[PDB]
Amino acid sequence: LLDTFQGYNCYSSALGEYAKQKNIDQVENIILSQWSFFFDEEQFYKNQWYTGAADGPVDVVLNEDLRNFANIEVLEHISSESQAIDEGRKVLEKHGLQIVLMDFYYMNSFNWKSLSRFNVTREHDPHFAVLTQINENSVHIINPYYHHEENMSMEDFIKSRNSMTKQGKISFNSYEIFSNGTKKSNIKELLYYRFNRYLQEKMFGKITQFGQVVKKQLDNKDRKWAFTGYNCLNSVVYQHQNLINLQKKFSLEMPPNLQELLDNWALIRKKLFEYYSRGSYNTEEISNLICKVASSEEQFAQEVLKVL
Ligand code: NA
């Protein structure tokens, strides 16, 4: 396990890791001060990632934050098999790193056997990685979200970048952090804007919506939603941990229950994974935990604005 920038999702992890290694200001703090929740009932039924901090794979709200606060643009480069590796060589020669979108079917990000899950289903899911080396027959990629690295055959790497996925066709997509005129933001300004937006957009109500949809799964013999939800909600745990770390680094005023809320989300994740794998009939219990944390998060956001 590498000491990679965690961010709160694969996209923000890759952007932050790049910024960390290349000394690009503001990107890390804008990521670490995100405060967000979404729920898409239509994605729930298609077994797509349907909740957590942000829709993806690209975090468009984070891109808007990066433009608004730092005048930083994350440029999407599409390419072709004829040009992509050569463009990669030019980017590595200049910058040493390239942010790429890859089909994670073709790599082994996370050790499921750590949670006693041995039936590790391969899925055509797009995730972000950082390319660090191009050799003749192989590449080295860092998966900062999962703290993993691997060497991949050039054949496999090319397949991972031209693949049809659940969320659409990858075409050698790469992502360039760019600015023609940067801006500095203070951490309290970033948090103020995020917490006001969280309350204005009633993001806590999307947690209640999620809880209500969980209550309605009592008769659903397909428990895959609970696994997807488990994976989706790591982003929320990471935001809570990131805010705890910001509190410490910047000696911030926080409401006193931030750790309790992190614990509440970790317990919801544990119960979702146990429901998925252990055949319990506790959708009502999990629904009740989610609806409880929704109320707690609304109050927490109000209190952050009072004390920040
Ligand atoms: Na991802």
mmCIF file of all heavy atoms in Angstrom, residues 17 26 45 61 74 77 82 94 97 138 146-147 155 192-193 224-225 233 238 244 248 281 292 306:
data_model
loop_
_atom_site.group_PDB
_atom_site.id
_atom_site.type_symbol
_atom_site.label_atom_id
_atom_site.label_comp_id
_atom_site.label_asym_id
_atom_site.label_seq_id
_atom_site.Cartn_x
_atom_site.Cartn_y
_atom_site.Cartn_z
ATOM 1 N N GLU A 17 -2.894 13.674 -6.431
ATOM 2 C CA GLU A 17 -1.587 12.967 -6.475
ATOM 3 C C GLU A 17 -0.671 13.687 -7.469
ATOM 4 O O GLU A 17 0.519 13.904 -7.160
ATOM 5 C CB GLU A 17 -1.792 11.502 -6.875
ATOM 6 C CG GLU A 17 -0.495 10.707 -6.959
ATOM 7 C CD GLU A 17 0.280 10.594 -5.656
ATOM 8 O OE1 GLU A 17 -0.361 10.674 -4.584
ATOM 9 O OE2 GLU A 17 1.527 10.421 -5.713
ATOM 10 N N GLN A 26 -3.067 24.715 -4.706
ATOM 11 C CA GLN A 26 -4.526 24.934 -4.501
ATOM 12 C C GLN A 26 -5.329 23.662 -4.774
ATOM 13 O O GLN A 26 -6.354 23.488 -4.118
ATOM 14 C CB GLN A 26 -5.045 26.073 -5.375
ATOM 15 C CG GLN A 26 -4.351 27.395 -5.082
ATOM 16 C CD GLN A 26 -4.608 27.869 -3.673
ATOM 17 O OE1 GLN A 26 -5.752 28.022 -3.256
ATOM 18 N NE2 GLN A 26 -3.542 28.144 -2.936
ATOM 19 N N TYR A 45 -31.157 1.675 -10.020
ATOM 20 C CA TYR A 45 -31.824 0.542 -10.720
ATOM 21 C C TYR A 45 -31.024 -0.019 -11.892
ATOM 22 O O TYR A 45 -31.280 -1.154 -12.264
ATOM 23 C CB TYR A 45 -33.296 0.857 -10.952
ATOM 24 C CG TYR A 45 -34.059 0.813 -9.662
ATOM 25 C CD1 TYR A 45 -34.594 1.954 -9.101
ATOM 26 C CD2 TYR A 45 -34.177 -0.369 -8.963
ATOM 27 C CE1 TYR A 45 -35.278 1.913 -7.904
ATOM 28 C CE2 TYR A 45 -34.854 -0.428 -7.764
ATOM 29 C CZ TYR A 45 -35.394 0.718 -7.224
ATOM 30 O OH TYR A 45 -36.058 0.664 -6.047
ATOM 31 N N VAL A 61 -18.648 18.828 -10.622
ATOM 32 C CA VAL A 61 -18.769 19.844 -9.536
ATOM 33 C C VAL A 61 -17.357 20.227 -9.087
ATOM 34 O O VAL A 61 -17.103 21.428 -8.929
ATOM 35 C CB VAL A 61 -19.643 19.354 -8.373
ATOM 36 C CG1 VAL A 61 -19.591 20.313 -7.200
ATOM 37 C CG2 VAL A 61 -21.076 19.142 -8.832
ATOM 38 N N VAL A 74 -9.280 21.483 -15.885
ATOM 39 C CA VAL A 74 -8.829 20.089 -16.127
ATOM 40 C C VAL A 74 -9.252 19.740 -17.554
ATOM 41 O O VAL A 74 -10.453 19.472 -17.785
ATOM 42 C CB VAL A 74 -9.337 19.105 -15.061
ATOM 43 C CG1 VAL A 74 -8.807 17.704 -15.344
ATOM 44 C CG2 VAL A 74 -8.947 19.559 -13.660
ATOM 45 N N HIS A 77 -8.261 15.333 -22.897
ATOM 46 C CA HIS A 77 -7.611 14.993 -24.182
ATOM 47 C C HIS A 77 -8.157 13.635 -24.594
ATOM 48 O O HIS A 77 -8.008 12.644 -23.851
ATOM 49 C CB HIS A 77 -6.081 15.011 -24.080
ATOM 50 C CG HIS A 77 -5.507 16.315 -23.648
ATOM 51 N ND1 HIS A 77 -5.447 17.415 -24.479
ATOM 52 C CD2 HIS A 77 -4.920 16.685 -22.489
ATOM 53 C CE1 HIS A 77 -4.855 18.411 -23.841
ATOM 54 N NE2 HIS A 77 -4.535 17.991 -22.623
ATOM 55 N N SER A 82 -3.200 5.417 -32.705
ATOM 56 C CA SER A 82 -2.037 5.846 -33.529
ATOM 57 C C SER A 82 -1.186 6.835 -32.734
ATOM 58 O O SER A 82 0.054 6.788 -32.875
ATOM 59 C CB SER A 82 -2.417 6.388 -34.896
ATOM 60 O OG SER A 82 -3.311 7.476 -34.803
ATOM 61 N N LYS A 94 8.109 15.641 -20.560
ATOM 62 C CA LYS A 94 7.918 17.044 -20.109
ATOM 63 C C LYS A 94 7.590 17.083 -18.606
ATOM 64 O O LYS A 94 8.241 17.870 -17.882
ATOM 65 C CB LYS A 94 6.832 17.715 -20.959
ATOM 66 C CG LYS A 94 6.548 19.171 -20.609
ATOM 67 C CD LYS A 94 5.929 19.967 -21.741
ATOM 68 C CE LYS A 94 4.567 19.456 -22.164
ATOM 69 N NZ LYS A 94 4.054 20.188 -23.346
ATOM 70 N N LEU A 97 4.527 12.475 -15.547
ATOM 71 C CA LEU A 97 3.250 11.825 -15.152
ATOM 72 C C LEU A 97 2.174 12.165 -16.177
ATOM 73 O O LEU A 97 2.168 13.310 -16.676
ATOM 74 C CB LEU A 97 2.768 12.323 -13.787
ATOM 75 C CG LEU A 97 3.713 12.166 -12.599
ATOM 76 C CD1 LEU A 97 3.140 12.877 -11.379
ATOM 77 C CD2 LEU A 97 3.974 10.697 -12.294
ATOM 78 N N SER A 138 5.581 -2.738 -21.850
ATOM 79 C CA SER A 138 4.978 -2.591 -20.499
ATOM 80 C C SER A 138 4.864 -1.119 -20.108
ATOM 81 O O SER A 138 5.596 -0.281 -20.670
ATOM 82 C CB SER A 138 5.774 -3.353 -19.470
ATOM 83 O OG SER A 138 6.942 -2.632 -19.096
ATOM 84 N N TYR A 146 -6.688 3.630 -4.605
ATOM 85 C CA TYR A 146 -6.589 2.286 -3.989
ATOM 86 C C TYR A 146 -5.183 2.030 -3.434
ATOM 87 O O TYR A 146 -4.955 0.918 -2.933
ATOM 88 C CB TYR A 146 -7.028 1.231 -5.000
ATOM 89 C CG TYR A 146 -8.507 1.283 -5.288
ATOM 90 C CD1 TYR A 146 -8.990 1.787 -6.485
ATOM 91 C CD2 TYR A 146 -9.432 0.863 -4.347
ATOM 92 C CE1 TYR A 146 -10.348 1.842 -6.752
ATOM 93 C CE2 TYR A 146 -10.794 0.900 -4.602
ATOM 94 C CZ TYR A 146 -11.257 1.401 -5.806
ATOM 95 O OH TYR A 146 -12.596 1.451 -6.067
ATOM 96 N N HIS A 147 -4.283 3.017 -3.490
ATOM 97 C CA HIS A 147 -2.903 2.937 -2.934
ATOM 98 C C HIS A 147 -2.139 1.747 -3.511
ATOM 99 O O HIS A 147 -1.333 1.158 -2.772
ATOM 100 C CB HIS A 147 -2.964 2.810 -1.413
ATOM 101 C CG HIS A 147 -3.960 3.738 -0.822
ATOM 102 N ND1 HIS A 147 -3.729 5.092 -0.738
ATOM 103 C CD2 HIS A 147 -5.204 3.523 -0.349
ATOM 104 C CE1 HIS A 147 -4.782 5.676 -0.207
ATOM 105 N NE2 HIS A 147 -5.700 4.735 0.041
ATOM 106 N N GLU A 155 -0.069 -4.242 -24.429
ATOM 107 C CA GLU A 155 -1.307 -4.855 -24.986
ATOM 108 C C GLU A 155 -2.494 -4.580 -24.051
ATOM 109 O O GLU A 155 -3.499 -4.010 -24.525
ATOM 110 C CB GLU A 155 -1.088 -6.358 -25.185
ATOM 111 C CG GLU A 155 -1.655 -6.894 -26.481
ATOM 112 C CD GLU A 155 -1.285 -8.341 -26.751
ATOM 113 O OE1 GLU A 155 -0.473 -8.900 -25.982
ATOM 114 O OE2 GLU A 155 -1.809 -8.906 -27.727
ATOM 115 N N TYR A 192 -16.647 27.457 3.738
ATOM 116 C CA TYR A 192 -17.862 28.299 3.800
ATOM 117 C C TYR A 192 -18.707 28.068 2.544
ATOM 118 O O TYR A 192 -19.914 27.802 2.662
ATOM 119 C CB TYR A 192 -17.460 29.767 3.942
ATOM 120 C CG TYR A 192 -18.589 30.759 4.046
ATOM 121 C CD1 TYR A 192 -19.259 30.967 5.243
ATOM 122 C CD2 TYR A 192 -18.959 31.526 2.958
ATOM 123 C CE1 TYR A 192 -20.283 31.893 5.349
ATOM 124 C CE2 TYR A 192 -19.976 32.465 3.051
ATOM 125 C CZ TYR A 192 -20.645 32.647 4.249
ATOM 126 O OH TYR A 192 -21.643 33.579 4.347
ATOM 127 N N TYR A 193 -18.083 28.166 1.373
ATOM 128 C CA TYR A 193 -18.800 28.033 0.082
ATOM 129 C C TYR A 193 -19.404 26.624 -0.006
ATOM 130 O O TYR A 193 -20.597 26.458 -0.338
ATOM 131 C CB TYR A 193 -17.833 28.320 -1.059
ATOM 132 C CG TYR A 193 -18.406 28.216 -2.443
ATOM 133 C CD1 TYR A 193 -18.795 29.346 -3.144
ATOM 134 C CD2 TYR A 193 -18.461 26.999 -3.089
ATOM 135 C CE1 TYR A 193 -19.287 29.257 -4.436
ATOM 136 C CE2 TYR A 193 -18.941 26.894 -4.377
ATOM 137 C CZ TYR A 193 -19.362 28.021 -5.048
ATOM 138 O OH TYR A 193 -19.822 27.869 -6.321
ATOM 139 N N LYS A 224 -26.957 -6.670 -5.179
ATOM 140 C CA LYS A 224 -25.788 -5.976 -5.779
ATOM 141 C C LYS A 224 -25.807 -4.495 -5.380
ATOM 142 O O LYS A 224 -24.713 -3.938 -5.164
ATOM 143 C CB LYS A 224 -25.784 -6.097 -7.302
ATOM 144 C CG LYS A 224 -25.313 -7.438 -7.847
ATOM 145 C CD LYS A 224 -25.122 -7.439 -9.352
ATOM 146 C CE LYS A 224 -24.655 -8.778 -9.879
ATOM 147 N NZ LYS A 224 -24.286 -8.705 -11.312
ATOM 148 N N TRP A 225 -26.987 -3.869 -5.296
ATOM 149 C CA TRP A 225 -27.104 -2.436 -4.892
ATOM 150 C C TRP A 225 -26.330 -2.186 -3.597
ATOM 151 O O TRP A 225 -25.795 -1.079 -3.448
ATOM 152 C CB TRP A 225 -28.561 -1.977 -4.740
ATOM 153 C CG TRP A 225 -29.309 -2.682 -3.652
ATOM 154 C CD1 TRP A 225 -30.064 -3.814 -3.774
ATOM 155 C CD2 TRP A 225 -29.360 -2.321 -2.264
ATOM 156 N NE1 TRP A 225 -30.579 -4.181 -2.562
ATOM 157 C CE2 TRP A 225 -30.148 -3.289 -1.612
ATOM 158 C CE3 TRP A 225 -28.764 -1.309 -1.492
ATOM 159 C CZ2 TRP A 225 -30.406 -3.247 -0.244
ATOM 160 C CZ3 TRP A 225 -29.024 -1.269 -0.135
ATOM 161 C CH2 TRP A 225 -29.824 -2.233 0.482
ATOM 162 N N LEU A 233 -19.993 4.833 -0.988
ATOM 163 C CA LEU A 233 -19.958 5.618 0.271
ATOM 164 C C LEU A 233 -18.537 5.733 0.815
ATOM 165 O O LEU A 233 -18.365 6.576 1.714
ATOM 166 C CB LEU A 233 -20.876 4.988 1.313
ATOM 167 C CG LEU A 233 -22.372 5.092 1.018
ATOM 168 C CD1 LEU A 233 -23.155 4.458 2.146
ATOM 169 C CD2 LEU A 233 -22.774 6.541 0.835
ATOM 170 N N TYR A 238 -14.173 9.313 3.219
ATOM 171 C CA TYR A 238 -12.945 10.081 2.906
ATOM 172 C C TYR A 238 -13.163 11.581 3.115
ATOM 173 O O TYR A 238 -12.251 12.230 3.664
ATOM 174 C CB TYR A 238 -12.474 9.771 1.488
ATOM 175 C CG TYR A 238 -11.925 8.380 1.310
ATOM 176 C CD1 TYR A 238 -12.103 7.686 0.131
ATOM 177 C CD2 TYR A 238 -11.193 7.759 2.295
ATOM 178 C CE1 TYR A 238 -11.562 6.423 -0.056
ATOM 179 C CE2 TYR A 238 -10.668 6.492 2.144
ATOM 180 C CZ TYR A 238 -10.834 5.818 0.953
ATOM 181 O OH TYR A 238 -10.292 4.568 0.811
ATOM 182 N N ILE A 244 -11.499 16.189 9.045
ATOM 183 C CA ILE A 244 -10.782 15.981 10.333
ATOM 184 C C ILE A 244 -9.326 16.392 10.138
ATOM 185 O O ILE A 244 -8.781 17.079 11.004
ATOM 186 C CB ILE A 244 -10.891 14.535 10.834
ATOM 187 C CG1 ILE A 244 -12.323 14.198 11.254
ATOM 188 C CG2 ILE A 244 -9.888 14.282 11.953
ATOM 189 C CD1 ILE A 244 -12.532 12.747 11.637
ATOM 190 N N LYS A 248 -7.126 19.651 11.911
ATOM 191 C CA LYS A 248 -5.844 19.504 12.639
ATOM 192 C C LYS A 248 -4.799 20.419 12.002
ATOM 193 O O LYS A 248 -4.074 21.117 12.755
ATOM 194 C CB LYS A 248 -5.345 18.061 12.598
ATOM 195 C CG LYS A 248 -6.135 17.056 13.418
ATOM 196 C CD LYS A 248 -5.427 15.715 13.559
ATOM 197 C CE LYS A 248 -6.383 14.549 13.713
ATOM 198 N NZ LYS A 248 -7.499 14.870 14.636
ATOM 199 N N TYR A 281 -31.793 -9.790 6.820
ATOM 200 C CA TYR A 281 -33.052 -9.157 6.360
ATOM 201 C C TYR A 281 -33.209 -7.834 7.102
ATOM 202 O O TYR A 281 -34.294 -7.568 7.645
ATOM 203 C CB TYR A 281 -34.211 -10.139 6.539
ATOM 204 C CG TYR A 281 -34.093 -11.340 5.639
ATOM 205 C CD1 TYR A 281 -33.767 -12.589 6.144
ATOM 206 C CD2 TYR A 281 -34.261 -11.218 4.268
ATOM 207 C CE1 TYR A 281 -33.635 -13.691 5.315
ATOM 208 C CE2 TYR A 281 -34.138 -12.312 3.424
ATOM 209 C CZ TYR A 281 -33.820 -13.552 3.950
ATOM 210 O OH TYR A 281 -33.688 -14.636 3.131
ATOM 211 N N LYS A 292 -31.103 8.600 9.946
ATOM 212 C CA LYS A 292 -30.540 9.236 11.167
ATOM 213 C C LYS A 292 -29.353 10.118 10.772
ATOM 214 O O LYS A 292 -29.292 11.292 11.206
ATOM 215 C CB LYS A 292 -30.123 8.186 12.199
ATOM 216 C CG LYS A 292 -29.496 8.732 13.477
ATOM 217 C CD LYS A 292 -29.189 7.639 14.481
ATOM 218 C CE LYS A 292 -28.622 8.160 15.784
ATOM 219 N NZ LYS A 292 -27.216 8.607 15.627
ATOM 220 N N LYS A 306 -21.817 28.259 11.596
ATOM 221 C CA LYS A 306 -21.880 29.102 12.817
ATOM 222 C C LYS A 306 -20.474 29.285 13.403
ATOM 223 O O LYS A 306 -20.197 30.387 13.871
ATOM 224 C CB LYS A 306 -22.851 28.509 13.838
ATOM 225 C CG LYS A 306 -24.319 28.579 13.443
ATOM 226 C CD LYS A 306 -25.229 28.026 14.516
ATOM 227 C CE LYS A 306 -26.659 27.850 14.060
ATOM 228 N NZ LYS A 306 -27.500 27.300 15.147
#
